[model samples]
Target: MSISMTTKLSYGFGAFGKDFAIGIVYMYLMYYYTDVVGLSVGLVGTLFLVARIWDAINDPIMGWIVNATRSRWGKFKPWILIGTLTNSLVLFLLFSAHLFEGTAQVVFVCVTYILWGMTYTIMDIPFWSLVPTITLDKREREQLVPFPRFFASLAGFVTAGITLPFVSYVGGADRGFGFQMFTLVLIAFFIASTIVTLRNVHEVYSSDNGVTAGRPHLTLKTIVGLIYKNDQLSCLLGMALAYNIASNIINGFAIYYFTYVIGDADLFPYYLSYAGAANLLTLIVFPRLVKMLSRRILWAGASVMPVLSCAGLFAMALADIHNAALIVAAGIFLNIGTALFWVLQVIMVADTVDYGEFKLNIRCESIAYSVQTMVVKGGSAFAAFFIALVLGLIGYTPNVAQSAQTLQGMQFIMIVLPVLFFMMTLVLYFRYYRLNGDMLRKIQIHLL
Candidate 1:
C-alpha cells in the first residue's frame, strides 16, 4: 500500500515528540544535573559518558530483535508504540529528583541515566528504522523525512526553548521545581505524539527476500564483514560519528557557555530559544536552498558551514567579547550551520539505508539505522568524557560564577571542539561519500 500524506504527517508528529524529549536532554539536562540536582559538573558528565557508553551496545541488539520479529502490526510499528511509552516513563523518572544527596544521589543518577539512555535507544532506533519501510520511493522518502524533522525541530524548540521559560517562571531558575515542571510538560508531549504515531502512521513495506530474518543470525564476524563490504555504510557511519561529536560537544557545553562565558545563567533559555528559532527558519528555507543545489553541493555546504561558524565563535571568544548580544548573534549563526548540517546528514542516512539493501540484498533498515545510532551515541559518550575531562582540568565548580579559567574552558568547548570535529567530518565526507540523487535512483531501480 502506498503511504498517504496524512500518515506521513502523523509520523512526523511522532518524531516531533521524540525530538522534543531528546532535545530536552541536550538543551537542559546538564543544567538540571548541575544547577538543580547539585551534581558536580565533572560527576554529571561522567554519568552521561558511562550511561551512553552502556546504551550504545544495546542499539544493534535492538536492531536484531526488530528484524527478527514478524509482527501482525508490522516490524517497526509495534516497537514505536512500546518503546515510546517505556521511554517516556523512564524520562519522567530521570528528572524526578527524589534521591538523597552525596554518594546516594550519584549512584541514583548513574542507574536512572543508564536506564533512560537504553529506553531512548529502544524508541529512537525503531522510529528511524521505520523510515525506509514506510516507502520504497526515494523521492517520497525524502519528502517524508524532512517534514517530520521540521516538526521535530519545532517540538525541540517548544520543549527546550519555550517550555523552560515558563517552567522557570513557575518553579524558579535556581530551584528543582523548574526541572520538575519541564519533565511534566515533556511527558504530556510524549503521550500525545505516541498516540498520533500509533493511530495514523502505518508501516506499509516489509522485505520478503528474508535478507534480515531468513538469513542466519548475525555474528560479530558477519557484522564486520558487512561493514567491510559495504563502502557506503562505512562512509556514512564515519560521517555520522564525526558530525555527532561536533554537535554534542557544542550541546554538552551549552549551559557552561551561557553560564560562565556569557556570565548570565538566566539567559540560557532565551539564547537557546533564539538558536532554535533560527534553526526552524533554516528548515523552512532549506527546500528553496536545496532547489538551487544538488544534494552533494548541499552536503558540502552543510559540512563547511560548521567550520566557519566555529571559527567565528573562536574569534569572538579570543577577543573577549563577553557581551550577551554578541554571544546570541554567534549562536544564531552556529545554529543555522547546525540546522543545515542536520538536514543533509539525516537525508544521507536514509539514503544509506537504501544503499544497504542494494548491496547486501537484505533490508536491515533497523540494523543499518542502528549502526549510525551507535556511532552517534558513542560519539556523544566520548564527547561527554571529553567535556568532563576538560572541566576537571580547568577546575570548573558547579554553581560558581565565572572565573578566567572557566571562561576559557567554555570557549574551548563552544569553539575549539566543534571546529576540530567539523574539519574531520568535512574531510571524511569529501573523501568517502559519493551518494547523490543519481546513485540513489540507480539503487532504487535495482530494488524495484
Candidate 2:
C-alpha cells in the first residue's frame, strides 16, 4: 500500500526536531566551545574529529546491531525512541560543558559527544532502513526521505537564524546561561517529535505487489565490506562523500562568509532563510521533476546548480558587488540543488537495497544507510576540522573584521575547493552509478 498521508507526515514530523537538535550542534558547537567555553582552536578541532571519527565507525556497527535485533516495537522504532531520549539528555550535557573545566571538561566533551553520536545512529540507521519496506516500487513511493531532509534544511535555517539571537534575548549579558535554556527547549521539542513519530509510523511485514519481501542481515564485516560488494554503492558513496564535503564546507563557513564578505554578521539567517525557502519550494516540485526527467539528467542538473551558483557568487565578490538580493539569488540556486541531492540520495539508497539483495542475496537497507551516515558524519567531522584549520591558516579572529588575506582565504574555501567535490560527484555518478530508471526496473524484474 502507498503510505497514507497521516503516516507519511507523522513519520516525517520527527525529523524536524531530531535534525534541529543535531543542526544546532553541527553549526554552533565549535562556535560555543571556542568563544564561551574559552577553549583553544586546536583543542576544539581535535575534540570534534575524535567524536566524529567515532561516529563514522559507530554508525555501521549500530546498523549491524539493529539488523540483529528482534523486537515487538519493530527493529527501527524502539531504537528510534531510545536514541531520542539518550541523545536529548546527552545534548543538554554537551551544551552545558561550559560548566566544567580542566580534566573534567575533557571528560565531559569526550563522554557526551561520543555517546551522542552512537545514540543518534541507534535510531537513525533503523529509521532510514525502514523506508524501503514502506513501498514496493521504490520509485512509486515518495519515501520518507524528503520529509526529514526538508525539515533538516528547515532545521538548519532555524539553527542558523535564531540560536544566537535567542541566546542573547534570553540570557542577555550571560549568553552561556541562554544556551542552556535553548537546549532545554530543543530537548523538549525533540521528545515531542519522537513521541508523535513513534505513535504514527509502522514498518512493512509482508510482500507487496512484486517488490522485495525482506529486510536482510549483515555480517560483522559488512559495515566496510558492503561498499566493496556493491560497485554502484561504491560510486554512490564516492559521489556522496564529495557531495557532503561541499555541503559541509558551505554550511560550516556560511556564517563567516556573511560576516566577512557581506559585512553583516546579523545577515546570516536572512540569507539562509532565502535558501531554505527555495529548497522547500524545489522539494514540492521534486515529485513532478522526477516524473519528467531521467535520473542522470536530473542529477546532472542538481550537481551543476551549486557549482554555477558558487562561481557566480565568487565573481560578484571579486567585483566587490555584495548586494543582498544578488547574493541571496546565488544562495537560492545553491540550496535548491543541494536539497534535491539530500532528499533523493536516501530514496536512491532504497533502490540499491534490491540491487544488493538480487546480486548478493542479503537485505541491506540499514547497513547501506549506515554507510550513508558515516559519510554524512564523516563529511561533517572533516568540515569541522577543515573549517577550524583554515581559520587558523587565514588568521581568522572571531567577532572582528578579518584581514583582506583572511577574507580571500575564506572565499577560496567557500567558493573554490568545494566545487571540486561537486564535480567529483558528477563524474563518479556518470562513470560508476549506472542504476538509473531503466537499470533499476531491470534489477527489480531480476529480483522477481
Candidate 3:
C-alpha cells in the first residue's frame, strides 16, 4: 500500500523536531555547557553519560507503557504528545544556565538533562514503534522511514549549520541572548511537530488477543525469556547496539575535532550541513538502488560505508589535511556513508519486529523497538562516557585552544575509535543479522 503525503509530512515533522533537538544537544550542548555556562567539559560529559545511562534503562519500560496504552488517540500518539511538551519545556530550561552558577549550575544541568533524556525516549521509542504498525510491507515501510529521516537530517543540518550564525547576529556578542533565541526556535519546532503528529499518522493495528491492559505483567525473567526466545529480535538488537554506539561516538566528538584539532571553528556548521545534504541526496537515490540489490547486499554495503569513511578520516589525520575545504569534502563523504547506513538500519529494525511476530505469534512492536532503543541508548552512553574519559585523559580542556597532545588525542578518539566501532558493526551485521527479502516475504505471508 502506498503511503499518503499527509502521513509522510506528519512523520517528517515529528522526525525533524526530534533531530533538531538532538542537533542542538549533540552539537551545541557541550559547547553550551563549557563556553556559555562555564561548566567543565569533563563534568558536562560525565553528566550526559550518567543521565543517558539512567535514561537507557527506562526505554523498555517506556515501550511497555506504550504497549499497555489503549487510548482513543492511540497508544503511541498520547506519549508522542506528552513527550513533545515535556521535552520542549525541559530543553528550554536546559539552556537557562545564566539563572544559576557553581553548584547551582551543576544541579540545574543534571536535573534538566535527565528530564530531557527521559522524555525524548518516551517520544522516540513509541514514534519508532508506530512504524511497523503503519504497514507490514517491508519496502513501503523502508520508504516511509527515510522520508522522515531525511527531513530529520535536514533539521539537524539547519540547527547545527545555521544556529550559531543566527545566534551571533541576534545576540551580537551577548551569548546569553543567542542561546535564548535558539531556545525559541527549538520550542517553535516542538510545537509544530506536536500539532502535526496529533492530526496525522494514526495507529490502526494493535494486539488485542486477550492481552488485557492491566493484567499481571510478565516478570523480568519472563520478558528476558521472551526476548531471547526470538532469534531475529536478538540478532537485530546486537547489530543495532554495535552500530549505534559507533555512530554516536563519532557524532559526539565531531564538533570538537573540527573546532580545535582542525582549527576551523567557524566552518563547523558548513561541514555538518554539507554532510546532511549528501545524506539526504543519498536517500532520494536509495529506492532505485534497492531495486537492483538485495536487502542483505544493501545492508552489508551500507554497514561498511562508515568504516571506509573512518579510514579516510584516519588517513586525513595522518597526512594532516587541514585545509578547511578538504575537511568539508571529507565530511560530505562521511555523511554519505552515515546516511546510507541509517536508512538501512531503520528498515532492518522494522523487519526484525515483523520477524519476531511471525516466529512468536505475537506483535510486540513497542517492546521490540524499545529493545532496539535500549541497546542504542546504552551504546550512546558508552560512547559518551568513553568520549569523556578520553578527553579527561588527554588533558583536553574545553573553551581553550588545545595543546598538540590534546589535539592528537582528539584525532585518535574521533578517527580511531569510530573506525574500530564501525568494523565491529560490520561483523555483527554480516554474521548475525539474518533478515532478507525472501525471509521477510515468507514471514509476511505467514502472518497474513
Candidate 4:
C-alpha cells in the first residue's frame, strides 16, 4: 500500500516550518552573533564547531533511543514532537541573546545555540528516518522525496528572501528585538505545523533489528558497529558532507558577499530569491527529469551547474560588475542543481537503508538517517569555522567598508572554495556511490 496524498502533504508541510526556522539560523546566525550581538567572529565560530562535535555523539545516541522506543504513536513521532517544542524555545532564546550584555550575553548565546543543535537532532533524525519506514518501493521513494525537498527549499527561499527585510519592519532600528519577534512568529508556525504532521503521518512500516526490534540496551560497541559496518552509508555520508560544506559556505557568507563585496545589502534578497525560485522550479520538474535522464547525466549536470555559478561570480568580481541581474542569473544555475542534488541525496539515503537491511539482515532506519543530520550540522560548523577564519584573515570589521585585500578574500571564500568542495562531491559520488544501476534493482528484489 502507498501513503495517502494527505500524508505526503502533511509531511512536506512540516518541513516548511521546520526548515524555515533553521533556515534563518543557518543564513543569519553568524551575522546576528557578530554584528548584532557584538561577539567576536572567532567565538561564534568556535561555538558552532564545538556544538557539532557534541552532536557527533549526541545524534547517534538519539537514533538508538528512537529505534528502541515503543509507543502507541510509534518511535519517531514522539521524538519529533518533543524536539520541535524544545528547539523552538531555544530558537527564541538564541535570537534573543541581545537582551543580555557582555559576559552574560556570551554565555547565554553559547548555551542556547548548543541546546538548539541537540534538540534539533532529536527531531531531524527521526523525521528523515520516516522515509524508509514509509515505503521501501524505489519508485515510491523517488516520488515522495521531492515533496519535502520542495517545501524545504521553499522555506529556505522564504527565509532567504524576507528575513532581513522582515526584521527591519518589525524591530525598526533594534534588529535584535525584530529577530525576537520573528522567532516568536516562526515558533508558533513551527509547533502548529508539527502537530499537523504528527497527527497525519504514521509509520507504515517498522524496522525489526532483532532482539525485540532494536529495544535492547544499546552499547558503545553496537552503535559503532552499526555506523562502521555500512559501506554504502559511509559513501553517502562523504558525498553529503561535501555537498553540504559547499552549500553552507555559500549560505553562510551570502549576506556578507552581497552586502560588502557588492556594496549593496538590498541586493542580497534578490540574489537569494532568484536562487531559491530556481530550486523550487527544478524540484517541481525533477521527477520528470529523473524519468527522462540517467543518474549519471543528472549527476553531471548537478556537478557542472555550481561550478559555472562560481565561474560567473569570479568573472563578475574580476570585471568590477555590480549588476544584480548578472549575479542573480549566475545564482539560478546553482539552485537548479541544488534541487536535483537534494532529491538524489534523500532517495539515495532511503535506498541505502534498504541496502542495509538486505546485507546485514537488520534494519536500523534511525541509525542510518542520523548520519544525514550529523553531516549537515558538521558541514555548517565547518563552514562557520572557515568563515570565521577567513573573516579574521581578511581583517573584517562589522558594518564598515572593506579593503581591496578583504574583498578579494571574500570572493575567494564565497566563489573558489565552493567549486572545490563541489568537485569533491562529484568525485565521491561517481567513485563510491554504487547503488544506482543493477545493484539497486538487486537490493529491491532482495528486500521484497
Candidate 5:
C-alpha cells in the first residue's frame, strides 16, 4: 500500500530540521573555526579529514546496532529518537566554541565536531533506511522521495540565505553568541520534527524485511564482505562521493569566494539564496520530471548543470567579470543539478537495498544506508582538506583585499576542481550504475 499524505509530510518535516542543522555545519562550521575561533585553517581542515576516518567504522557499526535493535517503537524510531536528543546537544556544543580559548577551544571544537558526525550517523542511517523500509512500491517511493528532498532543500535555503546576516544581527559582533542562539532554536525544531515523524510514521516492512527477525551478526569482516558483494552500492558510493566533493567545495568556499574574490561579503547570501531557490524549485518539479523523462536521460542531463555552473564561474573569473546576474545564473544551474542528484541518489540507494536483498538473500537496510552518511561525511572531509590546502598555499588571510595570486587560487579551487569532480560523477554513474529501468523493475518484483 502507498503511504498517506500525513505520513509523507511528517517524514519530510523531519528532514527539514535534520538538514537545517547540517546546513549550518556544512555551510559555516569551517568558516567559524577559522574566522571566529581564530584557529589555523590548515589545522581545522585536518580535523575534518581525521573525523571521517573514524566515521568509516562509526557509521557502519551504528548501522549494525540499529539493525539489531528491538523495541515497542521498533528498530528505527528508538535510535532516531536517541540520536536526535544526543546529536542536538552535540550540535549546540559544536557552535558553542565560545566556551573555551586558545588550545582548549581548538580541542573542544575538534571533539564536539567529531562527536556530532558520529551521532548524526546514528539517526541518519536509520532515517534514510526508512525510504526503502516504509514502502517497496517503485511509484510510491518516487512520490515520497521528493518530500524529504524538497523540505531538506527548503531547510538549506533558509539556513544558507539568512545565516550570516542573522548572525550579525543577533550577536552584533559576537557571532559565537548568535550561533549558540541559532543552534538552540534549530534544536527545538529538530527535536519537534523527529517527534512528529515518530508519532506519525511507522515501519511498514520491518517484520517482513527481517528487521526484527533473524539477521546475520555484522562483524567488521561481514560489513566489508557485504559491501564488497553489493557492486551497485559501490558504484553508487563512487558517484555520490564525487558529486558531494564538488558540492562541498562550492559550499565550503562560497564565503571566501564572495568575501575575497568578489569584494562583497553581502553577496554570499544572495548567491546562496538563489542557488537554494533553484534547488527547491527542482525538487518541487521532480516527480513530473521523472515521469516525463527516463531516469537515465534525466541523470545525464542533470549532471551537466553543475559543469555549466563551474565553467561559467571559471570564465567569469578569467575575464574579470563580476556581473551579479551572471553569478546568480551560474549558481542556479549548480543547484538544479544538486537537487536532482540528491533526490536520485536517495532513490538509487533505496533500490540497492532491494538489489542486495535479492542478490545476497539478506536485508541490511541500515548497513546499506550507512554508506550514504559515509559518502557525505567523507566528501565533506576531502573537500575541506582540499580547500584548506589551497587557501594555505595561496597565503589566505581573512578580512583583507587578497593578493592577485590568492584570487587566482580561489578561482581554481572553486571552479576548476568542481568541474573535474563533476565529470568523475558522470563517469561513475554512466559506467557502473545498473539498477535502473529493467534491472530495478526486476529487483522490485523479485522482492515482492
Candidate 6:
C-alpha cells in the first residue's frame, strides 16, 4: 500500500524548517561576517573554503554511520532530531556573532560557521537517505519527493527574500540585531516544522543486504571507492553536475546581465518572478504529470524544454531585442523544465539504491546521496570560478559601460553555455539512466 496523507504532511513540513534555517545562513552569513561583524572578506572566504571542503568530506562519513546505525526509535530519526537541535543552536549563534573586536569576533564567527556546516550535514544526509527506506513504490515517491523540495523552495524564498524587512522590524537595519531577531524567528518556525517529520516519517523497509545490516569497520577507500563503482550512481552524478552548472550560471548572472547587457537592472525582478511562477506551477502540476507519463519520459521530455527555451532566448539576444516581455517569457519556459528535474532527482537516487544492491550486494544509500550533495556543491563552485574567469577575460568592470567583447561574453555565458550544458545533461541522463519503469520494476524485485 501507498503511504498515508499524514506521512506526506510530516515529510513536507520537515523540509520547511530545515530550508528556513539553511536559507538564513546560505544567503546572509558571509555578509553578516564581513560587513556587520568586521571580519575580513579574505579571511571569511578562506575559512569558508576550508570549512566547506572539510564538510564535503564529512557528508559520506555521516552517511556511513547512518547505514551502520541501529536503534529502537530507528536509525534515521535519532540523527534528524539530534542534528536539528545542534544546528538550530548554531544558527542562532551564527547571527549573534561576537559583538566585539580582537580575536574574539573572529574565533566566534569562524567556529560557529564551521560548526554550522557540520551540523547541517548531520541532519541533511540522513534526511535524504530516508527516502529509499520509506517506500520503494514509484507512484508514492513521485507524490512524496516533490513536496519537501516544494516546501523547501518556499521556505528558502521566504527566509532569503524577507531579510530587509525583518531587519527593519527588529531595529531599522541594525545588521546584527536584525539578523539575530530574524534567525530567532526562523529557529522557532524550523523546530516546529521539523518536529512533524521527526514524529511521522519512519523507515518502512527492512534490510535487503544480508550480513547484519551494520558493519562497524570502515576505511576511506572502502566507502569512497565503492561510491565511484556504482554505474547508476555515477551516471546520475554527471547529470546532476551539468544541471547545477547550467542553473547557477543562469542565476549567477542576473545582475550582470540585466545591468550591462540589457541596459536595465530594474527589469530583472520581473524576469525572476516569471521564472519563479513557472517553477511553482510545476510543483503544483507534478502529480498530474506523473500520472500521465513515465519517469523516463518525464525526465527526457523536461530536458528538451530548456534547450528550446535557450535557443529562443539566444535568438532574441542575437537580434538585439532587449524586449523585457520576451525575456520573461523565455525565463518562465526555462524554469518549468528545471522544476521537473528538481522534483525527480531524489526519487531517482532512491531507485539507484535498489540498483546498487541488485548489482553490488551492498547498499550505500547515504554514501551515494552524499555524492549527489558533494557534486552539487562542487558544481556551484565551478560555475562561480568559470563565470569570474570569463568576465575577467573580457575585461568586465562593475558600474561602467562594458566593452563589446564583454557584452558578447555576457550573452555567450547567458545564452550559449546553458544550452550546451543542458544538451550535455540530456545526453548523459538518457544515455546512462537505465532504471526506467520496466528495468526498475525488475531491479526492485531482484533486490527483494
Candidates 2 and 3 compared: the better one by lDDT is 3
**Where is model 6 more than 4 Å wrong at Cα?**
1-9, 24-48, 51-55, 67-74, 95-106, 135-139, 147-169, 194-230, 255-269, 273-278, 317-333, 355-366, 379-409, 431-448
Query: Can you give the lDDT of residue 441 in candidate 4?
Result: 51
- The candidate scoring highest on TM-score is 6
Score every model by TM-score: 0.70, 0.70, 0.70, 0.69, 0.70, 0.72
Kindly list the per-residue Cα lDDT of model 3 for residues 88-205, writing each as its tens digit.
7786774565645345444656677667667857866666555545545544554445445655646654654566565545434455445665677667776788788776644332
Weakest 10 consecutive residues, lDDT, candidate 1? 212-221
Which digits, one per residue and each the tens of the lDDT, describe model 5 over residues 1-448? 4433444466566677777767775665554655554435447567556654666777767766654434322345656666666677686674565546445445556666665666656756656655544544534454445555644656666765566555555445454555666666677787776678776655443444455534443432354475643555766676677666656666666444545543444434555557566666766664456553355456676777666666666666677554444443344454654565665665565454455554555433445566664765566445656566555544356657655445455455656555655555677666665545454455234435
| lDDT at 434, model 3 | 50
Higher-lDDT candidate of 1 and 6: 1
Off by over 4 Å in 2: 1-10, 23-34, 39-42, 69-74, 92-103, 106-110, 142-159, 162-167, 197-230, 262-281, 311-337, 355-365, 376-414, 431-448
For every candidate in turn, the CA RMSD to the true structure comes to 7.2, 7.3, 7.1, 7.1, 7.1, 6.3
- What do the candidate models score in CA lDDT, each in turn? 0.57, 0.55, 0.56, 0.57, 0.57, 0.55
**Sort order, lDDT high to low:** 5, 1, 4, 3, 2, 6
Consecutive 10-residue window with the lowest summed lDDT within model 3? 213-222
What local lDDT does model 4 show for residue 298? Answer: 61
Candidate 6, residues 240-352: lDDT per residue as tens digits? 76666655665565434544443445434654435544455665565346553355566677766656665666566677554543443444355654565653564455354
Tens digits of per-residue lDDT for model 1, 1-448: 4444434466566677777777775567555555644435456566556664666678777766654435422355566666777677666764565533335444665565555656667766666556545545544454445545655655655655555555555544544445555577677877777788776654343333334434433432354455533455566776677677666655655544555544445434556556656666766665445552355556577677666666665565677665555553464455754565654464465454355554555333435556676766476445656566555554356756565454344555645554544555767766655555455455344445
What shift in Å separates residue 11 of candidate 6 from its native position after superposition? 3.6
User: lDDT at 316 for candidate 5?
Assistant: 61
